[PDB]
């Protein structure tokens, strides 16, 4: 159960750091469409994690970066936490604007299964992905740092069985927020 | 064995990314004392990881940041990888200059043991710290990205049994490099 530790490191080393500061950074961007107040985290269960969101879906279009957040951690001065703002397109219309990113450790899990000395079977990718999501979900429920600042989006593509829309999937979560 | 996954994520998500670019970034700083060509990674086995190196030892003094490295990862545009350059003091003399940082996942392990729903006993901190170091050591030996760019510094303090010098410990590894 490698995913257990990854989910926890994901919270301890990232989410619990940037969530308390998130709304303030969003507010500043709006003043200096309007960006939503939640961090939208993509959790593909096939552990496919492209580095370019626009490559996953054309209807997901990069707009701008948030103001950076800096902190000193583990000897590194001014470690930089950045987040990208995306516009969600529907039939050529902008249907939403939000801070959007994949959950990186899912990309780490995928990479792990490719390394022989990592002792992690490629067959277990879906299982660890599910555990990661569940663990993360349990954490953020109890997480004091998370108060209406964060939304987990987890999904299973047909994987060439059918056609899938990542933009529509995010828009779904975004419209319920409304 | 949570440390196994953390060590691997440490390599996959950090070291294998920044090590190929490290020497070039060091070279640029020297031209634009002289900084060593290796990344020196502190691995305290008690999993104590202060965020301020100068608080660990006064003889470890922050000098400057390296040139930043940027890349797009998992939907985040221009994710920033930064590193701090430190001067090592000995009897008021500068005995060395190098890129120096703790290994962050050791701080994550420590934090994990404090969380009840993380299911990680505080007694196991030393054990996981050892596994983390060993796993990381095995990886970097086989790691193609690591060619004379990286040095692991692992240690056990007396923990108030005696007085310990972190600067002298780093200087030891640094002088063998010479
Ligand atoms: N710039 C860096 N400067 C120093 N060290 C780094 C950096 N990069 C990786 N490292 C080391 O490599 C480990 C990474 C395993 P991962 O698979 O990438 O998942 C990580 C990651 F998804 C998420 N996260 C953390 N910061 C950010 C960020 N700025 N933007 C987006 N996501 C972030 O938190 C997980 C673990 O967080 P940690 O800090 O505790 O551990 C890290 C750490 F040891």
Curated annotation (Swiss-Prot), chains A, B:
* Covalent cross-link Glycyl lysine isopeptide (Lys-Gly) (interchain with G-Cter in ubiquitin), where: 77
- PTM summary: Phosphorylation by TBK1 leads to activation and production of IFN-beta. The phosphorylated pLxIS motif constitutes an IRF3-binding motif, leading to recruitment of the transcription factor IRF3 to induce type-I interferons and other cytokines. The phosphorylated pLxIS motif facilitates SENP2 recruitment during late phase of viral infection. Phosphorylated on tyrosine residues upon MHC-II aggregation. Ubiquitinated.
Cytoplasmic compartment spans: 1-178
Tissues with expression: Ubiquitously expressed. Expressed in skin endothelial cells, alveolar type 2 pneumocytes, bronchial epithelium and alveolar macrophages.
Protein residues bound to 2',3'-cGAMP: 9, 14, 79, 104
Q: At which residues is Phosphoserine found?
A: 82
Q: Which family does the similarity line name?
A: Belongs to the STING family.
Please describe what this protein does: Facilitator of innate immune signaling that acts as a sensor of cytosolic DNA from bacteria and viruses and promotes the production of type I interferon (IFN-alpha and IFN-beta). Innate immune response is triggered in response to non-CpG double-stranded DNA from viruses and bacteria delivered to the cytoplasm. Acts by binding cyclic dinucleotides: recognizes and binds cyclic di-GMP (c-di-GMP), a second messenger produced by bacteria, cyclic UMP-AMP (2',3'-cUAMP), and cyclic GMP-AMP (cGAMP), a messenger produced by CGAS in response to DNA virus in the cytosol. (Microbial infection) Antiviral activity is antagonized by oncoproteins, such as papillomavirus (HPV) protein E7 and adenovirus early E1A protein. Such oncoproteins prevent the ability to sense cytosolic DNA.
The associated disease is:
STING-associated vasculopathy, infantile-onset: An autoinflammatory disease characterized by early-onset systemic inflammation and cutaneous vasculopathy, resulting in severe skin lesions. Violaceous, scaling lesions of fingers, toes, nose, cheeks and ears progress to acral necrosis in most of the patients. Some patients have severe interstitial lung disease.
Name this polypeptide is given: Stimulator of interferon genes protein
Q: Which organism is it from?
A: Homo sapiens
| Encoding gene per record | STING1
Which residues of the parent protein does this chain contain? 154 to 337 of 379
């Amino acid at each position: 159960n490698v995913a257990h530790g990854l989910a926890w490191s994901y919270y301890i080393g990232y989410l619990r750091l940037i969530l308390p500061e998130l709304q303030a950074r969003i507010r500043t961007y709006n003043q200096h469409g309007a960006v939503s107040q939640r961090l939208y985290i993509l959790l593909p269960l096939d552990c496919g994690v492209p580095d370019n969101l626009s490559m996953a879906d054309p209807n997901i279009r990069f707009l701008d970066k948030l103001p950076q957040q800096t902190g000193d951690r583990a000897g590194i001065k001014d470690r930089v936490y950045s987040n990208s703002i995306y516009e969600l397109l529907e039939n050529g219309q902008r249907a939403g604007t939000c801070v959007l990113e994949y959950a990186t450790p899912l990309q780490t899990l995928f990479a792990m299964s490719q390394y022989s000395q990592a002792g992690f079977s490629r067959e277990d990718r879906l299982e660890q992905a599910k555990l990661f999501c569940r663990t993360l979900e349990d954490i953020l429920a109890d997480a004091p740092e998370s108060q209406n600042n964060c939304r987990l989006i987890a999904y299973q593509e047909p994987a060439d069985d059918s056609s899938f829309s990542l933009s529509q999937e995010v828009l779904r979560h975004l419209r319920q927020e409304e």
